[PDB]
Amino acid sequence: VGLADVAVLYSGGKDSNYALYWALKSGLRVRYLVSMVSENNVELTSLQARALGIPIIKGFTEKEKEVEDLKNVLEGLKVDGIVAGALASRYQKERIENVARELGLKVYTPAWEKDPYQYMLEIIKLGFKVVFVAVSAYGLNESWLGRELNYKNLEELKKLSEKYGIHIAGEGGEFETFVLDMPFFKAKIVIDDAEKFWDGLSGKFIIKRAHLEWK
């Protein structure tokens, strides 16, 4: 119980968790984490759910139709609004506002239009333990895979942003992140084993095995 009942668009990244953090911490009642995946880092979202103790809904969707699948997942949930993690992208926001619109749901975008750099700093301050699980930008080499976001690493992104033109927050797909731990997790996600994959321009950090260390 709280001010409102909501669902949080969840994928495991820094953004989804940030939005999720903001909902919880500001008294919102989070009924479900809604993780939609399309045919192409998410089998990990189930651990975060077990660690958060919040039911997670896995949706499966060929584009231009996935909007319906996401709509039909929300449609059947007794909630007042959806909490998303957008920060700058507008085309993403548009699509999400339209589904919420047709469903009569209030949209909450807690990261919206906030400085990328101060944003990254904020995530570090709040105590987020974040890992880079993918990179795909000129200037970000194989050494970022599996690296943990810290004050040290952040300044390096800024430096590389102020050189190659990469978004400091991974906007547009520069990189992907996975959250091992944040204040509302009841357990920590420690990586037991994982391997890297570098195709020569882009990279991926695949987590083989991992467990939870309850706080």
Residues near its own copies, by CB under 8 A: 5, 31-32, 37, 43, 46, 49-50, 53, 55-60, 72-73, 75-79
- In angstroms, rounded to a whole number, what is the distance separating the alpha carbons of residues 113 and 86? 9
Asked if residues 21 and 130 have their Cβ atoms less than 8 Å apart, the reply is no
Q: Name which of 50 and 147 has its Cβ closer to its own copies.
A: 50
* Pick 35 or 177: Cβ nearer its own copies: 35
Smallest gap from residue 127 Cβ to its own copies (A)? 22
Q: What is the residue type of 105?
A: L
| CA 23/CA 116 separation, integer angstroms | 20
Question: Residue 101 corresponds to which tokens in the numbers above?
Answer: 């619109």
How many CB atoms are located within 10 Å of the residue 31 CB? 17
Q: How far apart are CA 7 and CA 18, in angstroms?
A: 14
Q: Shortest approach of its own copies to residue 139 CB, angstroms?
A: 35
Minimum distance, C-beta of residue 159 to its own copies, in the bound complex (Å): 40
Which of 79/130 has CB closer to its own copies? Answer: 79
Instruction: Please identify, using beta-carbon distances, which residue of 53 and 172 lies nearer to its own copies.
Output: 53
Name the residue nearer to its own copies (CB basis): 31 or 147: 31
Closest distance between its own copies and the C-beta of residue 120, in Å?
30
Kindly state the DSSP code that residue 148 receives in the 8-state scheme: B
In the complex, least distance from residue 155 CB atom to its own copies, rounded to whole angstroms: 37
Contact assessment for residue 44 and residue 69, using Cβ atoms and an 8 Å cutoff: no
